[PDB]
Amino acid sequence: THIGNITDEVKNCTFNMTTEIRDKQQKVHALFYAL
């Protein structure tokens, strides 16, 4: 909100990922295509 739009093809995904230190994980997000 901030021929056709891509709101039905892009999904907002939150997950955990490894940092450069193995003991801590970071919660991040990315926009992925549904395919």
Place this chain on the structure above:
Amino acid sequence: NLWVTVYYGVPVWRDADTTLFCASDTHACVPTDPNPQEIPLENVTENFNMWKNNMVEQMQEDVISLWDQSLKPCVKLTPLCVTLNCTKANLTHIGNITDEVKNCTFNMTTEIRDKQQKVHALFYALDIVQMKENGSEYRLISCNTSVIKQACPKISFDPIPIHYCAPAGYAILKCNDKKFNGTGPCKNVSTVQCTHGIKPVVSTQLLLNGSLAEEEIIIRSENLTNNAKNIIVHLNKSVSISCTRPSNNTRTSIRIGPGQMFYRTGDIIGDIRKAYCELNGTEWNETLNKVTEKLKEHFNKTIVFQPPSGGDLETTMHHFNCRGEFFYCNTTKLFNTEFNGTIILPCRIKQIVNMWQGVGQAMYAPPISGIINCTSNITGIILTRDGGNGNTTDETFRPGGGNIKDNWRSELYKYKVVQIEPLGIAPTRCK
């Protein structure tokens, strides 16, 4: 009444860049010991330019390739990027290195993935960083840049002489002019198949274990009027310098995987005193006087020496290697303008080193057990002029490093590679 005659074997050469064989006694060079045969050339004047010589580039590539190939088949230290709980060391069982070592306790993986071992190590303060201010958490310096491979236990860090022998159809010309400064004509030329023993010694501010000038101190620079170009000062009388670590480290091993062993410092049992370099003050005074007199021939101003600036541990400290430990030595006392005896220069040891500025990632040097002591010869210096570009009465020179090629231009400056064209056409009265 003249006819064309064809000659094979004519002595004509042209400048050329080729791949030279490596000889010493994917990438390797292990032929037999060379037996140089020097053939002087009479009435031959040849132009030389040490700053446009491909031999330096080839040597750089060869050294990079050898160092990278040596480190390929041994331990990767990727489990070491963990949160280290580091506190003050207990070396009392005031010292001198108690402010440079930290006792770090941390967790590691083991043979089996589902259990972990709580172990400890003694890390030099330059190899670790603090995550949160005033806290007790520390991280390895390289964990945000690259993965580190431990030096293979069997790697010898002692340099071996390397000769560069040209293939068939090529020759190496050597300039025997004793007052040669790198660029210009040479009236005493010899031809060889390959060079003398060139040792790949890595150093920053002082050139070590190299050849000496035959007659006088030589000053080389690509462009003297440019302040960004370093000055190589080649001496004719070497200065002996000794460097020692008295701490008597203890090497202990942790099995961090299926056949992967990590060697670290366990305790400092004996002497507690900083590693240091001993030098003779009178000899250094004489050498500095000679260098000043020689440099006054080019710059007409008063010449003074000042310590390096910038604050970084590299490009300010004199970096070298002794038996496998990497020494960073403070030379502020050495270049400052007392000198009436023995000069003691403080030094510090680093374990996580990056010799080639990120080309070979990073390497962890395992500790060496015992009192360590090396002796070397200073044969040249690298200097940099402060480009004030003002109305001053003094020129200030500072010790300065730079590209490692400068350590190899100081010994390959008198060599040129040429390609032989053996076909000739002449008019002779032969039909």
Place this chain on the structure above:
Amino acid sequence: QIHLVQSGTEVKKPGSSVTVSCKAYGVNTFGLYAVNWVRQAPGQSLEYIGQIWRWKSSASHHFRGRVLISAVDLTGSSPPISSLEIKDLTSDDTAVYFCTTTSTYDKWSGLHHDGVMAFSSWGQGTLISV
């Protein structure tokens, strides 16, 4: 690049001597470059005066004993420079004097033939009126 700069216009009287300088920005050394001094009378063609080559000084037959040519290399505060001196001036020496520099590093260059040379780089030239 290579830029050669010379001294300005000079007006003298017969019987005196003159000196013209030539600073060579971009020339690493005169051991690999050759300096040639050339004359051009107003409305006429060019005339060779002299040469500094491999730190050897030479002058043509018409100028022997009257012209002295010197040169010094890169020093640290100034580029390499060359100097042309005329001992005895006369009314026929009024002309534009040019400083030229030619590379000699490659023996197969084609810009030089055993000392006698072409002129790749030229200076703006000075004017001497007697």
Place this chain on the structure above:
Amino acid sequence: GFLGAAGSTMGAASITLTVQARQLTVWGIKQLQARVLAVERYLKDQKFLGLWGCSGKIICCTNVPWNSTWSNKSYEEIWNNMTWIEWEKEISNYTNRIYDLLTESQNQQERNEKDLLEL
């Protein structure tokens, strides 16, 4: 020795060309490349020599007359004053022409010999 008498005149240099002519386990990729290139250069030189009927010779005489436009200097000046490098630089613009004429002369010689043997 090898490349000795490079500063000597061509008269003295042509006496001992054979001294220079004679000199003309994971190894590593660069060593293989260097060896192959050396073999190729030797074979190219041998191909040029054999195209003119001088396959196994050091001094070989031909039937191509010397054109004065290639070089108009005296015999004594050539063989008693200059060196080999200076001479090769002087006539560098006519080498391809001379090579082509040598090849054509050898071809004509072979064809004429075949025709004569037919007779």
Place this chain on the structure above:
Amino acid sequence: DIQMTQSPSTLSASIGDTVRISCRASQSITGNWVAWYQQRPGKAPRLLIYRGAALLGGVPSRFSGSAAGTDFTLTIGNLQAEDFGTFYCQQYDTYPGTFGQGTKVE
């Protein structure tokens, strides 16, 4: 010793034309030791051709040259405004070097 002469002392042409300039030497130069220079009024001459038919770096491809014994030729195709001025011809076979009397392109 070698004295060189240029025939077309005065020459005129228009933009887009092609011009030829000829040098004759008193002796044959078998080594093609001839150079061609260009000079505009109030400026130092610029070297354009060396070794008879070789171009310097940055010289436009329009200029060309040919050498044959005593006859040397400079050819300028698609003549532009910046190409006018005095063209000079030099030899460097026999010491000392000697220049021609120059040809003016108007």
